[PDB]
Amino acid sequence: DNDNSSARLFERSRIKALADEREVVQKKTFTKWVNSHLARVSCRITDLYKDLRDGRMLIKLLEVLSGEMLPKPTKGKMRIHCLENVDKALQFLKEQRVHLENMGSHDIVDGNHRLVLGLIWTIILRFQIQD
Amino acid sequence: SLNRRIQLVEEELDRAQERLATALQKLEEAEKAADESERGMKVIESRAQK
Amino acid sequence: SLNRRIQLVEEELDRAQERLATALQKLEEAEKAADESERGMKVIENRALK
Amino acid sequence: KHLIEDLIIESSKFPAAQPPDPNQPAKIETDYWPCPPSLAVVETEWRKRKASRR
Amino acid sequence: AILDIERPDLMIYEPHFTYSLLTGTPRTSLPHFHHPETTRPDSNIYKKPPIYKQR
Amino acid sequence: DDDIAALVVDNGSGMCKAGFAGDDAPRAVFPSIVGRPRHQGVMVGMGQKDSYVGDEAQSKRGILTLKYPIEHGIVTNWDDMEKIWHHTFYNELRVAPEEHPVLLTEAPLNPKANREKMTQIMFETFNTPAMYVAIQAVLSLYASGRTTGIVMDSGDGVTHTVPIYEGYALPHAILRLDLAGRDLTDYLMKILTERGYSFTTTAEREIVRDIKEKLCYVALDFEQEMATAASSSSLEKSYELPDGQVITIGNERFRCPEALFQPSFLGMESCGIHETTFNSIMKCDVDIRKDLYANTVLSGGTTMYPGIADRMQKEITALAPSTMKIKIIAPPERKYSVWIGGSILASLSTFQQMWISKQEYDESGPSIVHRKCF
Amino acid sequence: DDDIAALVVDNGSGMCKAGFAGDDAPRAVFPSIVGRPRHQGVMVGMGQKDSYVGDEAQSKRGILTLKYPIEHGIVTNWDDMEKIWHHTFYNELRVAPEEHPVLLTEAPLNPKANREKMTQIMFETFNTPAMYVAIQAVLSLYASGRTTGIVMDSGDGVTHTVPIYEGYALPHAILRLDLAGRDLTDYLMKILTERGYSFTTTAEREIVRDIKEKLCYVALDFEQEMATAASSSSLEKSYELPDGQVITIGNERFRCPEALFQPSFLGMESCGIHETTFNSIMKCDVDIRKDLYANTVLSGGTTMYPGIADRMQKEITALAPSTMKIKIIAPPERKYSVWIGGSILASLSTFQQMWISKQEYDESGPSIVHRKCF
Amino acid sequence: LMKILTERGYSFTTTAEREIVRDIKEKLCYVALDFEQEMATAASSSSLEKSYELPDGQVITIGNERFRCPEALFQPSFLGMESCGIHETTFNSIMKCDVDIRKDLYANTVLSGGTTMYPGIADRMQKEITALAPSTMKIKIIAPPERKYSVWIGGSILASLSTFQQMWISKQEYDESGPSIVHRKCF
């Protein structure tokens, strides 16, 4: 009742406000970081959530950072082709002993905010960059 | 005929998306105001019970 | 090809109308809740001041 | 880990992803904290409110 | 008729032709067909050539 | 300033919460469920994912077997708990675990090995600088803002009451009862069959848990409530399943939470929660009972049912001598209160001498947690 | 004559059995099927028959659409229930139903409206002076002759277990798995499609059921039997269809009842029957598990597959601690055990008080059964 | 359709005439939205009749038999079969699934195959499924205009994927493990 209404107020205000504030600032920081590496292949992204759905930006970012060419993307504009390209990128990430969890192809394709942010965070933190 | 109809339907898609975004902004502002008002109510409740 | 283009645009437009329709009723509901907290103000204040 | 990413890691350590402005009070100091304060603080607040009401 | 018989456990309605023939079982699951194999952890299946091409 | 906020992680039976020290509220809250697929995958080309963690498991629960790594306050599947902690650190907070200290909670009475394992995994696999293990009822008393009182905390897996007078806890009066929300959910399944509704699998367990959260309350008087429910159909509510079917809960709204007060319904011999609190109070000394009566603190999500404070107050008032005050203090944000206590515990200036360093761990093994933690 | 013999009627999903109190065997046993003609009559003046009940429907299978009034132990259609009950009383028994008491059996966990409807039908329509309703797996202990043991009753509708220690039954340890023989019939129909034999109509499900009853057995070791079946063709049998065609059952004989022990074949995530028995054991107290291990009792027709007792003994021996001995008691007349013990219930002198009188029903409605029975 | 065209006096018996009857069915059959109303309309007036030309110049009139043949898809008692209709089969296949995944399955029904090319099949299927389903759920029938070749088209998709090169049953595998290998690889 009223106590439940107060609990709903507390959670909806504080938890959601703090989570969204931190997530917005980290999204801006991650976008600014990834654009610098993506500029060398003359590719630029505007929104981090939507432009990683297709999967070509992710495979080109891994192309920049690794220095080794990846298998070519599948020629398609469907859902299953996006799943193929994201699976290729995640297989390459598994190949370099980087540990990822709760991260399937459909999570990146459907555009989950937390999992995309976690993938970018793991790329920033654990991955080895050579020049 | 089909090439004529394409631009027409795209125009209402454009307008609908625009005021959908406007309505979303208005709704989230109203939600924030309502939460702030309700915690303002709890404060005076604590006044009276103490 | 043009037929399928028309189909996709029509489906997106319908989704836009549905989202706007939900947004309007959520706006009305938030406004009414704010008004209800606003009436609760003066009765709680009167009890506190007495 | 090179040099640019270390700044990102250092920025992520704060509660918000940006370092706070020093003039603002902490969230323990603001009224947003819902835990009750000490009794005599409420007593002095009531005394100040009564003095302001006069 | 029950009140005469001592044991209904040892009771015959018919010969029944019983006994004519001649660590527990772990839980099992149905197989999957959406990915080829998992024999090599952290293996890239996109590097590998197709199976029929290898001769 | 070189002062870094230490992560506060509340790991309960049902949900996991996490945030930064000195904050008002946790940043991340998500169920502690690990799921795995149970059918054939025929659409070749899609990505393969072995395990689903958290809300991702809850959204796709229709094709998974949901397993809880923590049951009755004791963690059994350690790899699932590792996955939960790792997803908390890397996807929900996005922080480096080797930079910040961490703070963990547990039930008062539990197997001694868990703490040691909870140390050994945290220093080795995550390489945190320091950690500390606290007890949830003490943190609830911190969040209440009072030095003295009796704390009763019931989560999804365990219930426990501790008395604390002026900061000195009495360990011989700490009571632990293995009655919580999971058994209430199971009893709700067992009594929902009377109306003809069948719920068997784990997805149905989540659905029944949602039904219990939305449409349950504690009756002030059990017999009069049963007589009123038998007299007319005024006490009836309707719920909609995710299929679209409509069920009518009817009489079973208050019979499920009544098992918290009469555990004979579940076949348990032990007494109710009110008698547990009363026996914990009478196990203390004579001079501190009056202050413990006036400062009863409720905690945990299981104490969130409507009408719980009035029933608790009436029962304890019936048990106690008719001279002293019986005041039940239940904050509205009680479900998160334990976590809030952690945020106050890691922000104190004297607590920085209480961390278990990596150097001490290397010197004395995982058994240092018994010496350095209550 | 004074006291008159009270008739007992065992109703299940598969067959209906009926007989007097003192008899060692039921008067009459017949399937619980109602048939109706699908085609249209063409000759003038055979005679009218709107419905076919019992063995007449089984004789004319290929002209009717067979229907079962009981689904998973619940009476779905009631007008059919008066049809079978009238055929039982006035045709198979040739007795007046208004001059005898009636004993009936039902599943442990079922909707209460079922019990209320049977009570109302037995009192308002058939004018029975008294009636009683009992749990089947309780009556299996009366048939066995011991007052301490655990019963697993597997019929065509449900599979339920109940432990009783020295005449006291523990209600919180009762489990009701929904796996039964009709699901095995459907699985046999699905796996005979592999060899090319197609069985679709309702009149052909009886043929599939007869094939199941005749040429099926439970393998002691499943994977070794798979290897033997893949090696040679020694374990192959031939069945004779009613129209003269010959089918070769082959491998499938031990693949139908194996779904009892591994329900993942049928898509259910529930545990098998052996794990259900073990879980019902461990839900009881510490001191009575030793007696319950030595008195496991099988019941119901579904447990008439050859070799099921040895498989259950091996599985429970694997699950249980090694220091105890486990004996599975499977009488050769388990199919009528639910009947037989029920007959013993009608011969006791102290049972005359437990009957629900007509006056009690008249003064208390049909809800009196919730107080008088169980 | 042959057995019901016997009712008007037209005779078709040989295997060559079955192709003629199949052509007539493809050209002149449609699924009525309401069956009893359509029977009343066809009995009241002759506006529903159509004329077909035989390969030898004869002219026949179908009339009431245009929509009675596809109606047999929804009422199998016309053929003597006791099975249920296609809408009942779809609803039963939905109902056998778990509770959670039903809501997505109600809005994503897909038709395929040539037999589903009768004009008006989609509206009738949606109406019947909506009648069976609960009211709060919404039913969407997806009928692409080129559905006759969908079983081919997806196959042409499937062989073009990157990971499907890891799916093939090679010649060496068949030589090693005989013809029974197809159960291990193919679903």
Ligand SMILES: Nc1ncnc2c1ncn2[C@@H]1O[C@H](COP(=O)(O)OP(=O)(O)O)[C@@H](O)[C@H]1O
């Ligand atoms: N608003 C509510 N009303 C009733 N019961 C609730 C409510 N919220 C949570 N619960 C119950 O509390 C349980 C969660 O307990 P929780 O406080 O998360 O324990 P822990 O934090 O130790 O995991 C859930 O299983 C649910 O049954």
Ligand SMILES: Nc1ncnc2c1ncn2[C@@H]1O[C@H](COP(=O)(O)OP(=O)(O)O)[C@@H](O)[C@H]1O
């Ligand atoms: N000789 C047999 N061997 C194996 N299974 C059998 C045999 N006889 C019957 N059954 C199975 O048992 C079922 C009948 O069980 P029954 O005890 O009559 O159930 P109920 O009495 O509860 O209706 C049938 O459906 C059949 O599948």
